[PDB]
């Protein structure tokens, strides 16, 4: 049985980055050559694993995380990076074992006058731990005065919209991201390439 | 681009509630959020709240929290503002706006506005006016010109219209804004300056129409003797 | 909080002239400053955002400048439609509205013509007396009306209302109504309206005696 990579890569709609999606993959045969030999992806960088060995490796579980960001932020989806997306939305671990796949989606995720479905967290008083997902909407207290849950001066709503317009520069255009995580536990590996089946 | 059409004006009693609609004629609002801004008569603009339709979350200002509910039906491209426990202080015009944000500034500015919805709150009941004359005399002349008019008193709600001689007389006419009396009823006057050399020649009739009570009065104003 | 101060409250400029409106922020808002125009009876509309960027469809005779705490809205050649209220608004740290500047039509000074009207016998029959003082076709807008009943200054029992600037001659007119019960109206004789206006070298009084006409 193959792995349902099409559900993740070829999904109709993607999640906002602050509420990034995660799909568990197990008990299937994966064909990573379909992905590395695609040229549809502008970004395909692996960490802690080498890409050409993937078809000959097994793992206990593979997690695919999917979300949308803008072009200038694709570089933040890497270990050790900082910035608004890596600090407040989606953080990779320093010891990351997996791959980061991205591609431009300006045609799917833009609307004339702005597509506002895709949001990001702009304010947070602490950085995320790796793979932490914060979907709360508390008012962010920028000063010393309690905000009482009321938006206002020094009391920011923490989320903001990308507002993807098809006329934005490539840096401000939507990019779909899929992060694969290769997890190897003391348990029978169930996700293998075609060669290790 | 975006056209915002709001529901019509409302006259409401204290303690009751009102719900004002705002429809984006384009089939979409094309904004991150939609705000409601109110303006009391003669006053400035006060932000009340916004709804973020994508999240279904509404943030309200402190002055109305607990009394106000802002919603948005994505299917009909319509935002609603429901104000309850209405007091007379809520008498104002209410505007809906599409919000625009420029990172990293945290405030919105409003690039498109509905036409506004007047909400009058009063314990008064619908009453027609009484029309009394403001008759010309000698202390009512200033050279060759005299002044006369009509006093339209004790009506509710707004408005009344006033014309002179069934629209034939228009120059020199001043119909003043109504004043709200401590009784809760409205009162205005409409005056016109004419040559005093024709106060016996010309006949002057003010035509008063108060549509809310189906009251129409034609008042002849003749000089005093 | 950020406090927005607009000056002056009323800007009297003649048609076709240059208009300059000031907006001051109590602390820096960078360029996150918006200007709105509110024509009489209409909703506000956006003129400028980003301190100097015209909203779509706004003609080039409107322009904004400034950054930080000091902003200005300039109208290069005043048009009749441009006579309106103008609001600035910061959106740097949430939002704050300015108090508004009224751009008013500057015209030559014109003294009011004053008229007083005793209550009608019809109204007196009902039990109430209304005494009306009319100030007709004056400019500037500042005018002071004083009611005296037998030299007793009336305070708190009168209401006034003022027209907008006349579309033809740009003047104002004002109406002042003094309210008395019928019984109090008949206890007194001299009903006077004293009007103070810049176009008058001396204050003017119009008055009648109850029952004498
Ligand atoms: C996505 O769809 C394209 C064309 O429909 C197909 O060639 C590709 O293999 C699909 N990708 C995945 C991961 O299923």
Residue numbers in the entry:
A (entry chain C): 334 to 530
B (entry chain A): 1 to 225
C (entry chain B): 1 to 213
Cite, word for word, the article reporting this structure.
In the complex structure of MW01/RBD, the variable domain of MW01 was bound to the SARS-CoV-2 RBD mainly through its external subdomain. Specifically, the side chain of P104 in HCDR3 contacted the hydrophobic side chains of L455 and F456 in RBD. The side chain of G105 in HCDR3 formed hydrogen bonds with the side chains of K417 and Y453 of RBD. The side-chain carboxyl group of E484 of RBD formed hydrogen bonds with the side chains of R50 and N59 in HCDR2, and its main-chain amino and carbonyl groups formed hydrogen groups with the main chains of N59, Y60, and Q62 in HCDR2. The CDR1, CDR2, and the N-terminus of the light chain were involved in antigen recognition. Furthermore, three RBDs in the “closed” conformation could simultaneously bind to three MW01 Fabs without introducing any clashes. For S trimer in the most common “open” conformation, in which two RBDs are “down” and one RBD is “up”, the “up” RBD and one “down” RBD could bind two MW01 Fabs without any clashes. MW01 Fab binding to another “down” RBD would be blocked by the “up” RBD. Compared with their parental bivalent mAbs, the dissociation signals kd (1/s) of monovalent MW01 (MW01/KIH-Mo) and MW05 (MW05/KIH-Mo) dropped 6.1 and 1.8 folds, respectively. Notably, monovalent mAbs MW01/KIH-Mo and MW05/KIH-Mo completely abolished the ADE activity, demonstrating that ADE of SARS-CoV-2 infection on Raji cells mediated by MW01 and MW05 requires bivalent interaction of mAbs with SARS-CoV-2 S trimer.
